[PDB]
Ligand binder design. Structure first.
Ligand code: NA
Length: 129
């Protein structure tokens, strides 16, 4: 699924991501934009042989099992394929674990490089939430 901006904003809020670990909804929508362009089916191979899955590009190195990331972990206890679903429940659940790991949303390098410190509220502008 390619979510609309406000569509994804509404979904993230429903699943309790708005102000989770103190990160406003605009922060999460911005990370999704630059990680996946709001595409649930987005997959990207990392230089280390791990892969990034779904709207928030969750890495197989730590968080989900894809069977081809040697010496990895599955801390969200889910197949990475679950993270490509049109239903973002699994992605959100797992993102909550990631953002709680101690570096907040810096875990998403695209959030650090493209969202952090910016006017993230723009991403929820015009949305009925
Ligand atoms: Na893994």
């Amino acid at each position: 699924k390619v979510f609309g901006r406000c569509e994804l904003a509404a979904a993230m809020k429903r699943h309790g991501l708005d102000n989770y670990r103190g990160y406003s909804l605009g922060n999460w929508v911005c990370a999704a934009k630059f990680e996946s362009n709001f595409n649930t089916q987005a997959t990207n191979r990392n230089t280390d042989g791990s892969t990034d899955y779904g709207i928030l590009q969750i890495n197989s190195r730590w968080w989900c099992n894809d069977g081809r990331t040697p010496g990895s972990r599955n801390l969200c206890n889910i197949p990475c394929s679950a993270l490509l679903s049109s239903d973002i429940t699994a992605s959100v659940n797992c993102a909550k674990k990631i953002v709680s790991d101690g570096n907040g949303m810096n875990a998403w390098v695209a959030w650090r490089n493209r969202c952090k410190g910016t006017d993230v509220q723009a991403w929820i502008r015009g949305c009925r939430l």
